[PDB]
Design a protein around this nucleic acid. Structure first.
Lengths: 80, 24, 180, 137, 125
RNA sequence: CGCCUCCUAAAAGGUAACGGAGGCGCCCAAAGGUCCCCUCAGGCGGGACGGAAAUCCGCCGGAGAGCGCAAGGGUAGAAGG
RNA sequence: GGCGACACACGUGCUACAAUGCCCACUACAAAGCGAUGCCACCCGGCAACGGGGAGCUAAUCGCAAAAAGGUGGGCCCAGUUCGGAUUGGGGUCUGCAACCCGACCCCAUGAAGCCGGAAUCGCUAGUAAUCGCGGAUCAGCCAUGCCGCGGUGAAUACG
RNA sequence: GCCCGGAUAGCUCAGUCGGUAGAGCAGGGGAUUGAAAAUCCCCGUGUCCUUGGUUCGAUUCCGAGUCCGGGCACCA
RNA sequence: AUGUUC
């Protein structure tokens, strides 16, 4: 259903980031503090961090994740 | 069914207008 | 009869083959060989009679009465004590296998359990091919027919087919698509 | 560790007696050959008692060819007079042995380890040996 | 009788066999009768052969489904474990790829149960 | 403790010892007279319910199949199906 | 990230065990509420949700609201079924700036289960049981099937 | 070490003639009780000594030994 | 008519 037409949701800084890469070049990979935002193409492969509330859980971002978001590929919570 | 939709025995114990509650 | 395959291959397949490949002798080209029909289940003396129930419909269904193969012994048997029959069989080369199939093919086929695909890969490597099954009414002259009945079956085929090269050749020849 | 046995998968019946086949064996498949002396039926034991010392006396390692096989264990009725059965069964297996018959062929180590190899191997037993050469390969 | 891969339905009125199929969204049905009108009040048995046919290929050709329903089945789930989705460790672990509760009911992917034990002297409530 | 196949047994035939490894004291009306008929085990693969093994066809492969029940010989110009 | 962790044991609520169960065009009737920056008439796009848009009352004329449980005609033939919801995929939605963990839905497809549960342990002597519903608080928007509150129906039975 | 007889699940033991394996207990858990013991309820954990045979089939016909019990070893 | 514990 993917609701919220446009304007959906993203931050500010993070963008200043991608654009850099999609400007000066792909350069080096990166990292992140918290979480909560949708996915796009211009950024994929270009993996980075995703410090899950407990310990770092970054995703070598890809395309399977077409236009989904971070919700599904944001692993955490004990087990085994 | 009781816990089932697309009728009224559900739309009642749930709260859901939809194409199943307008008028004209 | 004097319809499809007839003035088909025998006036059309040939005039194609021609340049559509470099052939030599006639009785040594993508000719033909035989039409094989066979079946098996797993049950034996369930009463010994049910067994003849199949015996009833089946064979005549095609339009031919074949030879039998039932029983072996009241032994343990690894894959069931069953008396140990097997099934039955028979074959043909006459127009019974002419118009007979014209129908079962262009008709029974596509009303398949999932159209938009054909198995031209269950091939061997020569005029040897094989495709199992598990239908019944799908037949043209036998649509529905014997609900009280019900069972599985299977088929085999033979041609010169140096390999499935002559096999698949017949494939697109008059249908028999590629599973994709 | 390593306490098993070794003998034709299972049995192979239990019966035989002897000869002398005044020796045998051909060229070789390996290098510095080990040539026999004495004609007899041999023991799993004597075998092991040899490659041993050699091997560790072959620190970094060793290696040699092992031509032959097991054939018949034996009898030897433990006590009293003598009648039936076949004691001495799962007791001791013998390999077919011909006078001077070949037995082994070293490598990797030259007449430093290989010399003694044979000069200690033989010693391990009553009979002795010599080296390889050519003959045919 | 084959409006698609073997359409066994036969022995009643349209308003009898119908959607008891698998991939069945009663919508297009009121379309066979909407866009056109191949009504419901016709006993399958006599379901006018004219209706019969036009209905057959009606949704036999072009209309992908049934078998293709299975298609996505994999894509969704399978595509998730070939990748890196958490819901992915769900379907792939007998876990109901729905995302709801915890320790309260499984009967979604796997099912039933196998027990172990409890702290020596472990009560009930 | 009577007999059945091979070993021992030293190539005619025989050959012994509380020496090794196996057997029978039944069964058959059809497992029997008689005439036209196959092939095998099986390796390959093609191929619903078929993981060896459901089953079937083409290749090869002559007996290792196999022929009341032990072993042995004979044997597909089969006794043998 | 996290108490909305998972292999299994007790409870207490909502439903299938469906053919007095089935659905609809339509058509009939309670109390308690609760309305302010509040209940939104009503035309409609929309099959719909939503939303647009706009009056009342400026407040018991203006809102929730229509009804529900019925009537009826019109339509299945105990099949584990015009049964059933797990469930599984998505398409829009919507307060919250924003709902992956977990949001509440308009709408498309899915058929676990299961013919009433061992041994048991549960209310209640009159509207009594049982039943179909509507409004209270809380939360900004919520899975509150909560407990709160009110009724259009409405049986048994008790030697002792 | 002679022979006869002897190795089922946790273990106390069945299984006349082979082809859908038990009970007694056992323990598991629900239903108890204030709690607990006596229950009522329902189940599944065995390669029936490895290994080697017939038969299509072996827990039951066949050997091997690790072991298990009975009898076993006297004038001399 | 038969029934044990803290």
């Amino acid at each position: 259903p993917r609701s919220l037409k446009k304007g959906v949701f993203v931050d500010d800084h993070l963008l200043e980031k991608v654009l850099e890469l999609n400007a000066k070049g792909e350069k080096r990979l990166i990292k992140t503090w918290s979480r909560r935002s949708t996915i796009v193409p211009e950024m994929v492969g270009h993996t980075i961090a995703v410090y899950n509330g407990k310990q770092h859980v970054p995703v070598y971002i890809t395309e399977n994740m077409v236009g989904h978001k971070l919700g599904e590929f944001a692993p955490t919570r004990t087990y085994r | 069914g009781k816990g089932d939709r697309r009728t009224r025995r559900g739309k009642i114990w749930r709260g859901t207008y939809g194409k199943y509650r307008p008028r004209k | 009869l004097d319809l499809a395959l007839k003035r088909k291959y025998y006036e059309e397949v040939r005039p194609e083959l021609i340049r559509r490949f470099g052939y030599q002798n006639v009785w040594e080209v993508p000719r033909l060989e035989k039409v094989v029909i066979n079946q098996g289940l797993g049950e034996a003396k369930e009463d010994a009679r049910i067994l003849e129930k199949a015996a009833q419909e089946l064979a005549l269904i095609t339009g031919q009465k074949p030879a039998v193969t039932r029983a072996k012994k009241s032994i343990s048997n690894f894959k069931l004590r069953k008396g140990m029959p097997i099934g039955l069989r028979v074959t043909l080369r006459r127009d019974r296998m002419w118009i007979f199939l014209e129908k079962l093919l262009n008709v029974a086929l596509p009303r398949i359990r999932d159209f938009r695909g054909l198995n031209p890969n269950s091939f061997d490597g020569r005029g040897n091919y094989n495709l199992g099954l598990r239908e019944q009414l799908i037949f043209p002259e036998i649509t529905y027919d014997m609900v009280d009945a019900l069972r599985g079956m299977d088929i085999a085929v033979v041609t010169t087919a140096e390999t499935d090269e002559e096999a698949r050749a017949l494939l697109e020849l008059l249908g028999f698509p590629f599973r994709k | 560790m390593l306490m098993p046995r070794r003998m034709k998968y299972r049995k192979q019946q239990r019966g035989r007696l002897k000869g002398a086949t005044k020796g045998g064996d051909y060229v070789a498949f390996g290098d510095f050959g080990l040539v026999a002396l004495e004609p007899a039926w041999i023991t799993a034991q004597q075998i092991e008692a040899a490659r041993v010392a050699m091997v560790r006396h072959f620190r970094r390692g060793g290696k040699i060819f092992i031509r032959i096989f097991p054939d018949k264990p034996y009898t030897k009725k433990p006590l009293e007079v003598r009648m039936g059965k076949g004691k001495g069964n799962v007791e001791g297996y013998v390999a077919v042995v011909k006078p001077g018959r070949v037995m082994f062929e070293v490598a990797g180590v030259t007449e430093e380890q290989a010399m003694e190899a044979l000069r200690i191997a033989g010693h391990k037993l009553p009979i002795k040996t010599k080296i390889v050469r050519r003959d045919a390969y | 009788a084959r409006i698609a891969g073997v359409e066994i339905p036969r022995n009643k009125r349209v308003d009898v066999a119908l959607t008891y199929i698998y991939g069945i969204g009663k919508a297009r049905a009121k379309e066979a009768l909407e866009k056109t009108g191949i009504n419901p009040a016709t006993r399958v048995k006599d379901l006018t052969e004219a209706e019969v046919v036009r209905l057959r290929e009606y949704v036999e050709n072009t209309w992908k489904l049934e078998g293709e329903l299975r298609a996505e089945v994999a894509a969704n789930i399978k595509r998730l474990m070939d990748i890196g989705c958490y819901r992915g460790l769900r379907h792939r672990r007998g876990l109901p790829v729905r995302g709801q509760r915890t320790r309260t009911n499984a009967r979604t992917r796997k099912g039933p149960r196998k027990t172990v034990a409890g702290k020596k002297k472990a009560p009930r409530k």
